[PDB]
Structure formats: structure tokens, C-alpha cells
Design a protein around this ligand. Structure first.
Ligand SMILES: Cc1cc2nc3c(=O)[nH]c(=O)nc-3n(C[C@H](O)[C@H](O)[C@H](O)COP(=O)(O)OP(=O)(O)OCC3O[C@@H](n4cnc5c(N)ncnc54)[C@H](O)[C@@H]3O)c2cc1C
Ligand SMILES: Cc1cc2nc3c(=O)[nH]c(=O)nc-3n(C[C@H](O)[C@H](O)[C@H](O)COP(=O)(O)OP(=O)(O)OCC3O[C@@H](n4cnc5c(N)ncnc54)[C@H](O)[C@@H]3O)c2cc1C
Ligand SMILES: NC(=O)c1ccc[n+]([C@@H]2O[C@H](COP(=O)([O-])OP(=O)(O)OC[C@H]3O[C@@H](n4cnc5c(N)ncnc54)[C@H](OP(=O)(O)O)[C@@H]3O)[C@@H](O)[C@H]2O)c1
Ligand SMILES: NC(=O)c1ccc[n+]([C@@H]2O[C@H](COP(=O)([O-])OP(=O)(O)OC[C@H]3O[C@@H](n4cnc5c(N)ncnc54)[C@H](OP(=O)(O)O)[C@@H]3O)[C@@H](O)[C@H]2O)c1
Ligand SMILES: [Mg+2]
Ligand SMILES: [Mg+2]
Lengths: 313, 304
């Protein structure tokens, strides 16, 4: 057999990863994709995705992901459910190392490892993920029409999130661990003006009650005191996100919070032949359509760079 | 109202879908002639989510009907004028009625430039494509042509050699309007054959492109390239005419947007889809930017 040199390796599942895989495959770049031992993206918990254009009746998160995945496979993507520990990006013939110690190399690399939402890690929380507890108001906010809900955080996100929710919720109760707020004095100012916004300062969350649905939010420390229950039917966490740039952070330019910077209005990182899609880069709109778009854009950018770069030949 | 959306298509519809779900009560002017670039596409295979592919119109209808479901007001009529300066923006329909909003989302996209030769429009998406990243796959091992003498025609034709066994680049003049590296790369490709000083005049075939009727040979005339697929690469024309005095556009007419966002050069005015994008003209891309416009506009509206 002739063991050729691969054109593209993709790091990451999720809409950005799989769309890139789909495009690269269809462009006969024979993409090798490392899905992760724990594959899928943020959508593997979302019960009903209603704002992915094309699905008038909505689609289950995982259903959507399997289709993207199966699409990718159909055009010849090599998908592998394993993790990348190391990544050498400098030079032509880039390199990637999996958890088993095996090295896998390619001419271009598509970074699409996304970004984990920061969670409270309180007993009831992960259980009710996407059946009461969301981390995204632009996604799930609709599903809480006229309900009494909470928003957890004291930052610009928590403010923006909670303010936005007021168009659906009748009560948005903004809960926060400390007295001051690490958020802006305009976002706070806007939050304070909203008649549906109620503040709960110096209170940490202790649990999230309910079996099928959020039933209450167990608060605790009242600066000095302790224990209480906000009778809410939905809890939006707004602690921020943690982009998965650890493999790449300082071979490549990243912002202070760890998001990969990309050149101009493109997907090209600060290293030739290395490209970045999805929420690993995007910190403004964390949608699947936007992830899928950028994923596609990576694959096209990479094609062009490859074409430009074998073409001297 | 908070937001008026100008344009149907993936960018328009996704923006509408998002705005609607955000309870911004979006008014969308679809155009008297709906749909986008996809209303001609027979089989869409690289829109992520559709393992079995979907017909262009089918996909569009779903996007449309999705938008309707979350409370979009869709109107199949044309906007003739657009006043964007100030708060309380304005739009005027072909019937002379004014419709106003706080924000506006420009999503009028960009029409591919066609030859307008009798056979061509009839076989649109059944032989004649305007997009190699889209339809290139469908031409495996076929003899095809690419029409143009610019960098697109070069890029397009060079890309297609991955699938086609012959890509025959036909062009009206001796001299090529394209770059001398794109040309250079086009010349080095074994599968690339040039046809200079030749205009196209028809496209033969009923169910499929069967030949490409070539024309004037500088002095001579008439001939037939036995091709089974014709890719047009004459460029695109972005529909910025309503907006091209108020908002910043590039020389070719594409709306410039601020940084990595959808905001044009006028506060409260936003641009998505192929009206802005001139590098990847995909539906996923347009849908993405559509959505990004809605979110940008919501945040701008909320900021106040
Ligand atoms: C409840 C909910 C509802 C939502 N609703 C919508 C909606 O309606 N419409 C919409 O468009 N969006 C929606 N979203 C947002 C959407 O989930 C995200 O924007 C999307 O998941 C981003 O994908 P990504 O590819 O950028 O990264 P991710 O989704 O995180 O996927 C990237 C990944 O890469 C893998 N990975 C990372 N590093 C490695 C490594 N070193 N080795 C191997 N694998 C690795 C991980 O396993 C993960 O799968 C919703 C989200 C949630 C949580
Ligand atoms: C043959 C073909 C195959 C394709 N295949 C794929 C594919 O497989 N996968 C993929 O991802 N992409 C594909 N594409 C590309 C995709 O179709 C485009 O990116 C998409 O159509 C762009 O949509 P848009 O929102 O930019 O607006 P466009 O689609 O460019 O146009 C939308 C429209 O908006 C309306 N409009 C314009 N001006 C006004 C106005 N002033 N007032 C009211 N309405 C107005 C018009 O009615 C028009 O229909 C294909 C394109 C073609 C032609
Ligand atoms: N331009 C923008 O604003 C933009 C737009 C959209 C999204 N974003 C995203 O938003 C982030 C920006 O920061 P942010 O707005 O999220 O604020 P943040 O800086 O992340 O603030 C987090 C604060 O929330 C509180 N908190 C964290 N964990 C808690 C817990 N377990 N229990 C109780 N309280 C807890 C803490 O307050 P204390 O430490 O004070 O106790 C913590 O300091 C970025 O990561 C970005 O991804 C940014
Ligand atoms: N940068 C890229 O490589 C690339 C990538 C993606 C998208 N695009 C987009 O595609 C366009 C790039 O420009 P382009 O290379 O397509 O050229 P263009 O800028 O769109 O110009 C069109 C030219 O095509 C020529 N032409 C070729 N054949 C013709 C014919 N049969 N009849 C009439 N005119 C004919 C004409 O000039 P002559 O006949 O004198 O040559 C005409 O001026 C831009 O709109 C850009 O947004 C480009
Ligand atoms: Mg955040
Ligand atoms: Mg073009």
C-alpha cells in the first residue's frame, strides 16, 4: 500500500468539527478527525434544538449531532473517538499525539475543540441539565415563558443573560456569591432598572431541587447566616465559559481568557496551516449554526491554503 | 418594531428565526421573488444536519416555516427605498407604504453573474452550476467547462480537476483579467485546457448538459465543446443598491461589516449572508451570519 501524508487533521467533535470534517471530506482531503473519548459538543445534553435552521419541528441535540457525524462519515471522514494529549503545530507536516501515545501527522490542522460552559457542580445541577438548568439564554429562554427563574453570576454575562430573559420570564432572580459585582457599572445599572430583575447578594447556591423539572433553588450562606429555598422552576448559570485551548495555548495567539484569536475575518490562527473554528474562537454567539458555519469556513480556508501550498509543485 | 429584515434566504431566514424567538417581532421582506440561491439547487448535500441531503427549496421552506413558527411576519414584497440614519429606521415597499424599525438586518445576498444564453437558465443546477464548492462532487470523471478569465474562474477550474477529468476553461479574450499566479497555477494543471478568444452562445441538452456551443474564434465562428457540465465563474453581484450610499461597501459593492461582527458602519444597521461574504458562499455560512446579525441586533437593542 501507499501510505500517503494526510492533508488535514481535525481536533474536536461538535458542529464546528463535523462541518469542517464534512467539507474537507467532500473536498477529498481525507480528513482524520479526533472526536474525543467523550464526543459530541454542547448539544449532547440539549433535549430540543429549535433554532438550528432547517428543522421546522426542532431536533434532539444528539440526533442533530449523529446526523452531522454520519454526514461526515459518508463523504469519507475518518472519525476516531479518542483524545489528543499533545499537538506540535510549527512547520509543514504538523503532528498530533493521542492518549495511547501514537503520533498522527498532517499538513493542515483544524482546531475545533470548542468551549466548556462553567457549571456550579452542585448535586442536583448536572442531573437537570437541559430540563430546568440551562447555561444559555439565547437557546433555552423561550422554554421558560412566564416562569420564575434565577440567573447565577455577578458578571456582564449574568447581567446580559438575566436582562434578556425578562422578555420571557416574569421573575428573573439574579443570585450572586458576594456583595459587589464583578460586572460593569452599566450592565448592573441596566439590570437594576429592569422591573423583573431581583438581586440576591452574598448568597451561594447549595443544590437544585426537582426530579423531572427544576422545582426550587437551594440557597445557603447569607454572609453570616445559612439555608433557604428560592421557589424557582428554572436556573440559568452564567459563570462564563472555559475554551479548550490548553493543547494550543502559546504555540498560537489566544486572548487572556484563552480563546484562540483568528486572523481578520477568517479562520487562520497565527500559525500557517493551523485553523480555528467553533466556540474555541467564538465568545459572542455560541450557537451551533455559527459553529457549523465556522467549521465550514475552516475547511475551505484549509483547502485554499493547501492548494496554494502544493501548487508550488 | 424592533427589527425589520431585508431579504429571504438562509441569512435572512435564520436572522428572522432568531429575532422571532427573541420576541423582537421581526418583520421580514422576503421579496416578490423569494428564496435565495438555493431555490434552483436540486440536491443540497453539505448543509450539516441532513445526512441524506435535501432539495434547495425544501430546505428553504423549512427555514421559512421555522421562522413563521416563532412569530416572524414574512411579507413577499420588495423594498424600493431604505432610510437607515438615526433611531427609528425606515423601509419603503414597492406599493409605496413605509415600514419602520429600531434595527434593520440587511440580508439581500448576492446574485451570481450568468451568461444569459438560451440553454443556460433552463439547465440551472442540472449541468450548469455557478459554484464548484457546491456542485463539484456531482461531476466525477466528467468533461466540463468553466467560463471566465478571472481569479474565480482560475480557482474554480483548478479546484474541479479533483473531480473532473477535463476542465476546459473558455474565455472571451486573448488576455486574462486574472492574476499571473492563478493563471500560472491553472496552466500547470494537466487537466486544465484553455480556450481563448471564444464566446459562449448556447448550452445544449434537455435533461442534462450535452454540449457547450462556443462562438466567435476571434475572426471565425461556431463550434461545439462536447461537455456534460458548465461552471460559470463571471463573478457575483451583491444587492447593495438600496444601501450603497449610506453604508460602507467594498469597490465591488459588498457591505463591509465592523471587525468580526455583523454591524455595518451605521448604528443599528446589520449585514449578513452573501451581501457581505465574498469568500465562502455557503448556506451554513449565510445561516450562521444571519443568526449572528439577530444576536448583534438584540444586544444593540438591549444596550438601548
Ligand atoms: C441546551 C443547549 C441548547 C442549545 N440550543 C442551540 C440551538 O437551538 N441552535 C444552535 O444553533 N445552537 C444551540 N446551542 C449551542 C451549541 O451547543 C454550541 O454553540 C456548540 O456545541 C459549539 O460546538 P463546537 O464545535 O464549537 O465545540 P463543541 O460543541 O464543544 O464540540 C467540540 C468538542 O471537541 C472535542 N474535543 C476537544 N478537545 C479534544 C481533544 N483534545 N481530543 C479529542 N476531542 C476533543 C469534545 O469532545 C467536544 O465534542 C445550544 C447549547 C445547549 C447546551
Ligand atoms: C446551484 C447552487 C448550489 C448550492 N449548493 C450549496 C450547498 O450544497 N451547501 C451550502 O451550504 N450552500 C450551497 N449554495 C450556496 C447558497 O445557496 C448561498 O450561500 C445562499 O443562497 C445565500 O443566501 P443569502 O441569505 O446570502 O441570500 P441569497 O440566497 O443570496 O438571496 C436571497 C434573496 O433575498 C431576497 N431579496 C434580495 N433583495 C431584496 C430586497 N431588497 N427586498 C426583499 N427581498 C430581497 C431575494 O428574493 C432572494 O431570493 C448553492 C448555491 C447554488 C446557486
Ligand atoms: N463582551 C462580553 O461581555 C462577552 C459577551 C458574551 C459572552 N461573554 C463571555 O462571558 C465571560 C465574561 O465574564 P462573565 O460575564 O462570565 O463574568 P465572570 O468574569 O466570569 O464572573 C464570574 C463570577 O461569578 C461568580 N461565581 C462563579 N462561580 C460561582 C459559584 N460557583 N457560586 C456562586 N457564584 C459564583 C463569582 O463572583 P465572585 O468571585 O465575585 O464571588 C465569579 O467571580 C467570558 O468568559 C465570555 O466567554 C463575554
Ligand atoms: N478572490 C478570489 O479568487 C475569489 C474567491 C471567492 C469569491 N470570489 C468572488 O468572485 C469575484 C472575483 O472576480 P472574478 O475573477 O470572478 O472576476 P470579476 O471581478 O467578477 O469580473 C468579471 C469579469 O469576467 C470577465 N468575463 C469572463 N468571461 C466573460 C464572458 N464570457 N462574458 C463577459 N465577461 C466575461 C469580464 O472581463 P474580461 O472578459 O475582460 O476578462 C468581467 O469584467 C468577486 O466578486 C469575488 O467576490 C473571488
Ligand atoms: Mg460566557
Ligand atoms: Mg466570485
Amino acid at each position: 500500500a501507499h501510505h500517503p501524508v494526510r492533508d488535514v487533521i481535525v481536533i474536536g467533535s461538535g458542529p464546528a468539527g463535523y462541518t469542517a470534517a464534512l467539507y474537507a471530506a467532500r473536498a477529498q482531503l481525507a480528513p482524520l478527525v479526533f472526536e474525543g473519548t467523550s464526543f459530541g459538543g454542547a448539544l449532547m445534553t440539549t433535549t430540543d434544538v429549535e433554532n438550528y435552521p432547517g428543522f421546522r419541528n426542532g431536533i434532539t441535540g444528539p440526533e442533530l449531532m449523529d446526523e452531522m457525524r454520519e454526514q461526515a462519515l459518508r463523504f469519507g471522514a475518518d472519525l476516531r473517538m479518542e483524545d489528543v494529549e499533545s499537538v506540535s503545530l510549527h512547520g509543514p507536516l504538523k503532528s498530533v499525539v493521542t492518549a495511547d501515545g501514537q503520533t498522527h501527522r498532517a499538513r493542515a490542522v483544524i482546531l475545533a475543540m470548542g468551549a466548556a460552559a462553567r457549571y456550579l457542580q452542585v448535586p442536583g445541577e448536572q442531573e437537570l441539565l437541559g430540563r430546568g438548568v440551562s447555561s444559555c439564554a439565547t437557546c433555552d429562554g423561550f422554554f421558560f415563558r412566564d416562569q420564575d427563574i434565577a440567573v447565577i453570576g455577578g458578571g456582564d454575562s449574568a447581567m446580559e443573560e438575566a436582562t434578556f430573559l425578562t422578555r420571557f420570564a416574569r421573575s428573573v432572580t439574579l443570585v450572586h456569591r458576594r456583595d459587589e459585582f464583578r460586572a460593569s457599572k452599566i450592565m448592573l445599572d441596566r439590570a437594576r432598572n429592569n422591573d423583573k430583575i431581583r438581586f440576591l447578594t452574598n448568597h451561594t447556591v447549595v443544590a437544585v431541587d426537582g426530579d423531572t423539572t427544576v422545582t426550587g433553588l437551594r440557597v445557603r450562606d447569607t454572609n453570616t447566616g445559612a439555608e433557604t429555598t428560592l421557589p424557582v422552576t428554572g436556573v440559568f448559570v452564567a459563570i462564563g465559559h472555559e475554551p479548550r485551548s490548553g493543547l494550543v495555548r502559546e504555540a498560537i495567539d489566544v486572548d487572556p481568557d484563552g480563546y484562540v484569536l483568528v486572523q481578520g475575518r477568517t479562520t487562520s490562527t497565527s500559525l500557517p496551516g493551523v485553523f480555528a473554528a467553533g466556540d474555541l474562537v467564538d465568545r459572542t454567539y455560541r450557537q451551533a449554526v455559527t459553529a457549523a458555519g465556522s467549521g465550514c469556513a475552516a475547511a475551505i480556508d484549509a483547502e485554499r491554503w493547501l492548494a496554494e501550498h502544493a501548487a508550488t509543485g
